[PDB]
């Protein structure tokens, strides 16, 4: 059968983990911070997902790259919910 | 085509590359002195990976998916164990 | 049709980000260093892509794993152009 496609990132020593799953054109998010998996706020269209994250001090910044067709949309976590980023590409 | 995921740690570095091929995920390893085959071998058509250090100790999480079922595999120094991850796909 | 596939890595606190996109058998690269996205030098064949990177001091090292069929080629950025690495697999 058609397999879902995942992307994962982690930070710190607890750690926090975020796993994004593209399934039937939608990306959803599962989260771990030491005490059970739960569903996160991220829910956006995409057949394909990649993720990277970095710390600035103790503040986490996450970038999720969601692709449908040739269009990749960047989604940004910087402490004020998810926001659409400036990323563009000419695919 | 086959599908891969990669993680690395330290400054040597160590690198681990996971490849999903014909329903199986295998692992190739670099620790500064050449590539060799690792112990990870579990079913999956899709793979992602993340890893983190606790001091000098590496912890690796491999997300192996077949259909809508994703199984998390955990390296914490004592072989690969199944993790608690679930998702409602 | 089938969506493009991406992989992403980041480093430092600016940060720098690199996003690799596999589109109709070719992988290209977009770059962020804090002041706008631009096109990078990576351009190699591939249907599937993953990436990892690490810092040695302030110097970035990037490894891109590009797959076509059962052949995965590692491409290495060590400051001086993209070169084929020693990665092999028996797929
Ligand atoms: O248990 S099995 O994995 O062997 C299985 C095989 C087939 C099946 O029809 C089912 C199970 C029942 C079934 C289960 C589910 S689930 O609830 O998600 O587990 C879903 C379906 C289903 O038929 C519906 C379905 C989904 C997809 S997908 O879009 O790729 O996920 C494909 C199909 C589905 O029927 C077609 C299909 C493909 C395949 S194959 O594995 O690709 O050869 C086997 C069977 C199929 O019905 C034949
Ligand atoms: O991208 S869309 O899903 O909107 C789309 C679907 C179909 C289409 O016919 C077109 C677009 C028009 C079209 C666009 C392009 S493009 O400008 O390059 O994007 C190319 C084609 C095309 O018909 C030609 C074409 C190429 C290929 S490929 O060489 O293998 O990539 C396959 C096909 C093509 O028509 C067959 C095909 C496959 C599919 S599939 O369901 O995605 O497999 C849908 C449609 C198809 O015509 C049916
Ligand atoms: O604590 C969970 C959460 O806030 O963590 C940061 C992001 O992963 C969000 O989508 C998510 O809801
Ligand atoms: O704060 C958001 C932002 O500026 O962060 C850096 C890059 O990810 C940009 O594309 C993005 O718009
Ligand atoms: O041999 C190196 C090894 O022990 O490194 C840690 C994990 O990547 C293991 O699967 C692997 O076998
Ligand atoms: O020690 C294993 C474990 O607790 O590590 C943190 C998460 O990866 C969990 O899903 C996993 O079961
Ligand atoms: O400054 C841009 C650049 O040199 O950054 C390092 C690599 O990502 C290169 O492919 C890219 O062209
Ligand atoms: O200096 C290049 C190199 O040695 O870097 C570490 C690994 O990526 C190797 O496959 C690669 O050939």
Author numbering:
A (entry chain A), C (entry chain B): 0 to 90
B (entry chain C): 2 to 90
Which text from the study accompanies this structure?
RSL is a C3-symmetric homotrimer with a six-bladed β-propeller fold and two sugar binding sites per monomer. Specifically, we show that the rigid, bowl-shaped sulfonato-calixarene (sclx4) captures cationic N-terminal motifs, resulting in ordered structures.
While one Met-Lys motif is disordered, clear electron density is evident for the other two N-termini which are bound by calixarenes. Similar interactions occur at the two bound N-termini, with the Met0 side chain trapped in the calixarene cavity and the N-terminal ammonium forming a salt-bridge to a sulfonate. In addition, a weak hydrogen bond between Met0 (C=O) and Ser2 (NH) may contribute to stabilizing the structure. For example, in the MK-RSL – sclx4 cocrystal, an intermolecular hydrogen bond is formed between one of the N-termini and a folded region of a neighboring protein (Met0-Nα···Ser57-CO). The 1H–15N HSQC spectrum of 15N-lysine-labeled MK-RSL has a weak signal for Lys1. The fast-exchanging component was further upfield shifted at 4 eq sclx4 (data not shown).
